[PDB]
Structure formats: structure tokens, C-alpha cells
Amino acid sequence: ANQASVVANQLIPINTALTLVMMRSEVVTPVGIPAEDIPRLVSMQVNRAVPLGTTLMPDMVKGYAA
């Protein structure tokens, strides 16, 4: 139920280091990367461009392992 995920706050381009302005927290379905992981994601890279409003999933971030 009320578990919040990391959602793209702007289009995130491929192979670009994640910054805090790119990530917001939102309750969405399906559930993606927990919103508590936003600090851990800073400077990690996505392996695909992520459109605005997309829920970040584990498989999209290079090197991510919960």
C-alpha cells in the first residue's frame, strides 16, 4: 500500500550521473526503487533515458543492487 518510489522529476538522459533535482518521491504502482534510496542513487547512472514521471526501477540504474 503506501510505499513510495523514486520517480523521474525531469527526463534523465542516458549515461548521465543522477543528481537530487532529477528525483522526487511518489506513491505509484507498480512499486520501483524505494524513495529512501534517493541519496544512494546520487551520481549513479541510468542505462536508458528515463522520461519525466517514470518510476525508476532497479534494472534501469547501472550498478544498483538493493
Curated annotation (Swiss-Prot):
Protein name per its UniProtKB record: Type-3 ice-structuring protein HPLC 12
Superkingdom of source: Eukaryota
Described function: Contributes to protect fish blood from freezing at subzero sea water temperatures. Lowers the blood freezing point. Binds to nascent ice crystals and prevents further growth.
Site location (Important for ice-binding): Q10, N15, T19, Q45
Organism: Zoarces americanus
Keywords: Antifreeze protein, Secreted
Family: Belongs to the type-III AFP family.
An example Gene Ontology CC term for this record: extracellular region
Tissues in which the protein is found: Detected in blood serum (at protein level).
InterPro entries: AFP_Neu5c_C, AFP_Neu5c_C_sf, Antifreeze_III
Source species taxonomy: Eukaryota, Metazoa, Chordata, Craniata, Vertebrata
Residue span, AFP-like domain: 5-64
Location in the cell: Secreted
SUPFAM superfamilies on file: AFP III-like domain
